[PDB]
Design a protein around this ligand. Sequence first.
Ligand SMILES: Cn1cc(N)c(C(=O)NC2CCC2)n1
Ligand SMILES: [Zn+2]
Length: 140
Amino acid sequence: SGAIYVGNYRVVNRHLATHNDWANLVWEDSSRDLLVSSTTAQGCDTIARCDCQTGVYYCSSRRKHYPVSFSKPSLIFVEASEYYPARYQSHLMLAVGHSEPGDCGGILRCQHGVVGIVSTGGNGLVGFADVRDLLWLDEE
Ligand SMILES: Cn1cc(N)c(C(=O)NC2CCC2)n1
Ligand SMILES: [Zn+2]
């Protein structure tokens, strides 16, 4: 589990979105495993605006933050998961590291702020759904 809280927006894995998230929907994309809902209170997180390929992610299944190198966001075949079938996921960044399904929502962060959230795992890789292209998260 986990979310990004930026202004009056809550960014979560689409597959972990609650009824309240869907009832307060701003934007969603199945291909990116992302959903954004509205919040009453303003949020503590800042979104990176950058093309960093190094950062740190939070891994709940280890209670640890790990520094990683990661690929630029791309369209990638992902094998079947407990919450999704084998499919292509877009805006996906991969790093060598530990990921289990419940790690989804862990933040990846660079010097510029929040890069993305844990979305995929298996075969020694961790995949992150990029948010840095979502410029509209910064306003309105
Ligand atoms: C976040 N996420 C989605 C997954 N499917 C996995 C995953 O397959 N985890 C295993 C543990 C050895 C890789 N992790
Ligand atoms: Zn950065």
